[PDB]
Amino acid sequence: VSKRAVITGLGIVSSIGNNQQEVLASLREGRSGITFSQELKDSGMRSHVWGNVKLDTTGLIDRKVVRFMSDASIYAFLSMEQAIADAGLSPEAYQNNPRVGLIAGSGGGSPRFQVFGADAMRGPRGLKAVGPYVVTKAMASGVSACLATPFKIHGVNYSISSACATSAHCIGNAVEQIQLGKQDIVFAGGGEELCWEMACEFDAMGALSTKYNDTPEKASRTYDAHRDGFVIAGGGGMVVVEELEHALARGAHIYAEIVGYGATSDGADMVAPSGEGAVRCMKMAMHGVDTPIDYLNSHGTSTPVGDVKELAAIREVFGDKSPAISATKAMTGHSLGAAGVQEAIYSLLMLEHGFIAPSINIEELDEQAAGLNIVTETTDRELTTVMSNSFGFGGTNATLVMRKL
Amino acid sequence: VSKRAVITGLGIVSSIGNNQQEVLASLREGRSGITFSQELKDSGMRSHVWGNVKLDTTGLIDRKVVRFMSDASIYAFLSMEQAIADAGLSPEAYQNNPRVGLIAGSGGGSPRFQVFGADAMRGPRGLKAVGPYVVTKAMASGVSACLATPFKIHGVNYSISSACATSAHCIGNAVEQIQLGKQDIVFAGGGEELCWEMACEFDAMGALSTKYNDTPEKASRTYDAHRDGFVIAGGGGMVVVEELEHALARGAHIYAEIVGYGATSDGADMVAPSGEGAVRCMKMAMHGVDTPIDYLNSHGTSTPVGDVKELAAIREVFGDKSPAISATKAMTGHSLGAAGVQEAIYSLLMLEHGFIAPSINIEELDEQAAGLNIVTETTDRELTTVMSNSFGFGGTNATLVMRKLK
Amino acid sequence: STIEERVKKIIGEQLGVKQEEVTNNASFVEDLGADSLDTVELVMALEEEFDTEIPDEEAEKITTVQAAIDYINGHQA
Amino acid sequence: STIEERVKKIIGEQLGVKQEEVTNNASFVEDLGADSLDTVELVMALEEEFDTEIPDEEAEKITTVQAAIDYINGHQ
Ligand SMILES: *[C@@H](C(=O)CCCCCCCC)[C@@H](O)C(=O)NCCNC(=O)CCNC(=O)[C@H](O)C(C)(C)COP(*)(=O)O
Numbered sequence: 005v006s007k008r009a010v011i012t013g014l015g016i017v018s019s020i021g022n023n024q025q026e027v028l029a030s031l032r033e034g035r036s037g038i039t040f041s042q043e044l045k046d047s048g049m050r051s052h053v054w055g056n057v058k059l060d061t062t063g064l065i066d067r068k069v070v071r072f073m074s075d076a077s078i079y080a081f082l083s084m085e086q087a088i089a090d091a092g093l094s095p096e097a098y099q100n101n102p103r104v105g106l107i108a109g110s111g112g113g114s115p116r117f118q119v120f121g122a123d124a125m126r127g128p129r130g131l132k133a134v135g136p137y138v139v140t141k142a143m144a145s146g147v148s149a150c151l152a153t154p155f156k157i158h159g160v161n162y163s164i165s166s167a168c169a170t171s172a173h174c175i176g177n178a179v180e181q182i183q184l185g186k187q188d189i190v191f192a193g194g195g196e197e198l199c200w201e202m203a204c205e206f207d208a209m210g211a212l213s214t215k216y217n218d219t220p221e222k223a224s225r226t227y228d229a230h231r232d233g234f235v236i237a238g239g240g241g242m243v244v245v246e247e248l249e250h251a252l253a254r255g256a257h258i259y260a261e262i263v264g265y266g267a268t269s270d271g272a273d274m275v276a277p278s279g280e281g282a283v284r285c286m287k288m289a290m291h292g293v294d295t296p297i298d299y300l301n302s303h304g305t306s307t308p309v310g311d312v313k314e315l316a317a318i319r320e321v322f323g324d325k326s327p328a329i330s331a332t333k334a335m336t337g338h339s340l341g342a343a344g345v346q347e348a349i350y351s352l353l354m355l356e357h358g359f360i361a362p363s364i365n366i367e368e369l370d371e372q373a374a375g376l377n378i379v380t381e382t383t384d385r386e387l388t389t390v391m392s393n394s395f396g397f398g399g400t401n402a403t404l405v406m407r408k409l
Numbered sequence: 410v411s412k413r414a415v416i417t418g419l420g421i422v423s424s425i426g427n428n429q430q431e432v433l434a435s436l437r438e439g440r441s442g443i444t445f446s447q448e449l450k451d452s453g454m455r456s457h458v459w460g461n462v463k464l465d466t467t468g469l470i471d472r473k474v475v476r477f478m479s480d481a482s483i484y485a486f487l488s489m490e491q492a493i494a495d496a497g498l499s500p501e502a503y504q505n506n507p508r509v510g511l512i513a514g515s516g517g518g519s520p521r522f523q524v525f526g527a528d529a530m531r532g533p534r535g536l537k538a539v540g541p542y543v544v545t546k547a548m549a550s551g552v553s554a555c556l557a558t559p560f561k562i563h564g565v566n567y568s569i570s571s572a573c574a575t576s577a578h579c580i581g582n583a584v585e586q587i588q589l590g591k592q593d594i595v596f597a598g599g600g601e602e603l604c605w606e607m608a609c610e611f612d613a614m615g616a617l618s619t620k621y622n623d624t625p626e627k628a629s630r631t632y633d634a635h636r637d638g639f640v641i642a643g644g645g646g647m648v649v650v651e652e653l654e655h656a657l658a659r660g661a662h663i664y665a666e667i668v669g670y671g672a673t674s675d676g677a678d679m680v681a682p683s684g685e686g687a688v689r690c691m692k693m694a695m696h697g698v699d700t701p702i703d704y705l706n707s708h709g710t711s712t713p714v715g716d717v718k719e720l721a722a723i724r725e726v727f728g729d730k731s732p733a734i735s736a737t738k739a740m741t742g743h744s745l746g747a748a749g750v751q752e753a754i755y756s757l758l759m760l761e762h763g764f765i766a767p768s769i770n771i772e773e774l775d776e777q778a779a780g781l782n783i784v785t786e787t788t789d790r791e792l793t794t795v796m797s798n799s800f801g802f803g804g805t806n807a808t809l810v811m812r813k814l815k
Numbered sequence: 816s817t818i819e820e821r822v823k824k825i826i827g828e829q830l831g832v833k834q835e836e837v838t839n840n841a842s843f844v845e846d847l848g849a850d851s852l853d854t855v856e857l858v859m860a861l862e863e864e865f866d867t868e869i870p871d872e873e874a875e876k877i878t879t880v881q882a883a884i885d886y887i888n889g890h891q892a
Numbered sequence: 893s894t895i896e897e898r899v900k901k902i903i904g905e906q907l908g909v910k911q912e913e914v915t916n917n918a919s920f921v922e923d924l925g926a927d928s929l930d931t932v933e934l935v936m937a938l939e940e941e942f943d944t945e946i947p948d949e950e951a952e953k954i955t956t957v958q959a960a961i962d963y964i965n966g967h968q
């Protein structure tokens with residue numbers, strides 16, 4: 005028989021909380037992670053906001069392992085430790101075990117350290133200034149390599165990259181490993197650094213927010229008529245995807261089962277979605293799921309184009325049976341590769357603690373958002389089935405559907 | 410875990426050939442693809458040799474398509490064009506088709522273009538010098554995004570990245586998608602660009618060959634006792650992974666069935682292999698395979714640390730029944746992210762054309778190759794089952810086993 | 816005028832979107848085969864050609880061949 | 893900070909060891925847990941700290957803190 009996959013542990017470092025407790029509080033309160041960045045302004049950009057991680061990471065991780073890591077790996081690492089703790093896994097349980105694996109990625113590796121390495125090459129010292137550690141900080145697989153090694157992972161070990169769907173495809177791929185019976189546990193998630201080196205390339209396409217540099221907590225404002233792009237964010241998240249029989253036999257806490265995973269492709273435009281991909285993606289995630297979506301964490305990035313196409317696709321999927329929607333990115337900003345796992349965790353906390361978090365900074369709605377149930381006030385509700393979406397450049401789409409046992 | 414998966418088409422852009430016919434000829438002749446590199450020497454680098462792709466790409470790709478692409482995406486796009494034609498596939502069959510996906514990656518996105526967009530931003534024009542196309546070029550998923558979009562792919566779409574195992578894991582995951590019955594066809598492969606910006610990061614580690622810059626074709630010399638590091642290379646490759654019944658019912662040409670896929674982790678050293686994880690990876694890929702491995706395409710990068718550890722692991726798995734072994738990187742150099750699929754392609758061409766390609770440049774064979782059958786001259790042989798290993802930094806291991814169809 | 820601006824713009828736009836003979840009523844997207852990023856890039860090209868920086872609120876409006884000529888003729892440089 | 897104090901701070905920060913467990917006769921590899929990439933980074937930091945170049949031939953000969961301290965003393 006094909007197996008079932010459940011979430012038995014989570015960890016997160018995000019612009020709105022350094023662990024799941026801080027995040028739970030933020031979600032209930034609609035607290036913004038967005039702040040003004042003197043680094044973005046000093047670089048020459050027109051976006052001066054960001055969802056930064058509010059934590060000095062200097063010296064938190066052992067020298068011998070942190071020497072290989074860029075910030076994406078740092079955040080994913082710290083998230084992993086919390087997830088291992090949450091799942092109640094001892095070292096003997098998950099280390100040196102061929103049935104325990106890890107799939108975790110970033111959207112962009114480390115632009116900061118690819119730039120460092122070249123800047124140092126071109127200087128007076130040459131190779132001597134580069135150092136022997138840039139490759140592992142810059143490779144696209146840094147997040148998985150820098151965690152699989154110190155945590156003694158013996159099973160699957162690789163990253164998925166799919167732009168801003170990255171960490172949701174990681175979770176989905178981890179579920180398929182469980183389903184195929186190849187792994188008992190897979191740590192799944194990702195991380196993303198926060199730096200002008202990569203922010204400025206988004207500004208050059210005019211995708212970031214330019215108008216609210218003086219009012220940072222308002223710049224990210226999904227579904228609002230005067231949204232002017234997304235607020236870039238950094239951070240990390242990790243969940244423990246576990247086979248159901250294995251979780252039961254060890255007495256684990258089960259947040260939820262993953263009952264659906266959709267992954268589709270638009271095959272259309274390189275930077276704007278098609279909605280058609282999203283429709284099939286949510287549909288394939290709901291396939292065989294005999295309960296309704298009680299809550300839907302949208303992808304919603306506060307972009308002109310993005311927010312509408314997803315509401316359109318949402319409207320086509322659900323008929324007169326629409327569920328509630330909020331864009332937590334209105335509080336958090338957009339962590340890119342780490343977005344999917346973080347939003348999976350926000351959705352899991354809404355399910356565990358029976359509320360719906362609000363989409364904030366909607367002063368004036370958008371006409372296309374009519375008839376839809378965009379929850380803008382924290383609301384207590386017994387949720388049973390939740391759904392989260394992530395989309396990315398290149399027309400890549402991911403959907404996860406999560407249900408209580 | 411029940412559908413069977415075959416390769417029905419392939420394409421490749423490589424230091425030893427711009428298509429499979431040229432690649433076949435180099436493989437049989439033991440021809441080197443390594444040349445001296447002005448760019449590398451100019452950068453300050455100690456390694457002045459590389460496996461460059463010898464191809465003028467001017468005009469090969471539509472302007473509205475190539476504007477989004479780094480070199481890695483270019484090589485993979487050209488490889489995919491080849492593979493679609495080689496599979497006998499027309500747009501009506503594979504485009505706008507939800508049962509057709511793409512899994513293809515790079516080891517490092519585009520270091521050249523991340524340094525570009527940063528060199529520009531810090532220059533006079535700032536944001537306008539950067540321009541609006543740098544994200545798709547530098548993002549890690551650029552290879553998959555820049556192909557799935559113009560080929561109108563509708564099924565799965567994402568990259569796997571695992572350092573130098575990248576495109577082998579892509580093929581493996583393509584196979585699992587067929588096995589799970591979620592896809593009828595998955596294009597799987599990868600590409601990597603070739604640039605000082607990335608190569609100097611390897612030079613700084615001590616990872617690259619530096620002692621043979623005067624004789625570039627002898628720098629890559631896996632299993633040679635005086636090997637001194639790998640020779641960086643670039644390129645792309647793509648194979649068409651297809652569900653078996655589907656292939657048979659359309660009269661496809663089938664190169665081989667993918668009968669094994671291993672994917673493990675060392676959990677030990679960030680940059681040196683444990684060998685223990687490779688043993689499990691090769692063992693995992695051989696599971697349920699009732700025919701012996703006739704030929705093994707090792708990862709074999711020409712590193713002092715790397716080559717012997719993999720030989721030790723091959724000994725452990727095979728014991729006194731060594732398959733024929735050769736390291737094609739001694740000819741081709743190391744294409745990083747693209748290495749897996751290109752070596753899967755070489756192994757498929759050895760299987761289709763009945764020969765073992767030579768492990769070149771072995772003047773003095775390392776004392777640790779004892780009891781291993783390292784083939785140093787082209788050998789015509791009817792092969793049935795071949796294996797290919799790929800390893801990466803971070804202790805990541807992949808193995809593919811490919812077998813002729815009964 | 817035409818060779819003062821209209822022709823020059825017209826040259827700019829035909830090389831940008833890759834097209835031949837662009838008509839004064841043409842829409843970059845609806846007629847000339849462009850998208851958002853092409854037009855972002857076309858604005859840059861019109862800035863190099865005339866040594867001027869086009870404001871954001873104005874560049875937002877430059878989506879037809881006439882909107883391009885009208886902007887360069889009706890302002891500075 | 894003299895030659896010795898600077899040398900031990902470099903060693904200490906990079907190998908993650910308190911600047912008192914840096915014995916003068918400690919071996920980077922045997923006593924302070926350096927691996928081959930630590931060896932590259934340590935030599936590169938020392939080279940930068942004292943503007944001296946250390947050929948590979950010399951760097952293999954330096955197995956101890958004191959040999960490093962002695963190498964820096966006798967080149968400039
Ligand atoms: C993230 C993403 O997918 C791409 C970047 C991730 C990797 C970074 C690596 C750097 C080295 C977000 O862009 C995202 O979530 N995208 C998914 C779709 N959402 C969305 O809101 C669409 C965004 N598009 C637009 O804003 C316009 O369509 C745009 C930019 C094309 C304007 O041009 P035109 O359409 O007017």
Ligand SMILES: *[C@@H](C(=O)CCCCCCCC)[C@@H](O)C(=O)NCCNC(=O)CCNC(=O)[C@H](O)C(C)(C)COP(*)(=O)O
Pocket residue numbers: 138139142143144516517520572573574607610614615616680681682710712713714715716745746800801802927928929
């Ligand atoms: C490729 C790889 O895994 C990294 C890919 C990076 C992708 C692009 C990043 C852009 C910034 C090869 O490094 C590879 O295939 N590695 C796996 C095989 N290993 C191998 O051959 C041995 C490697 N290690 C060593 O040779 C030594 O460990 C060395 C010289 C690095 C340090 O010496 P110390 O251990 O004695």
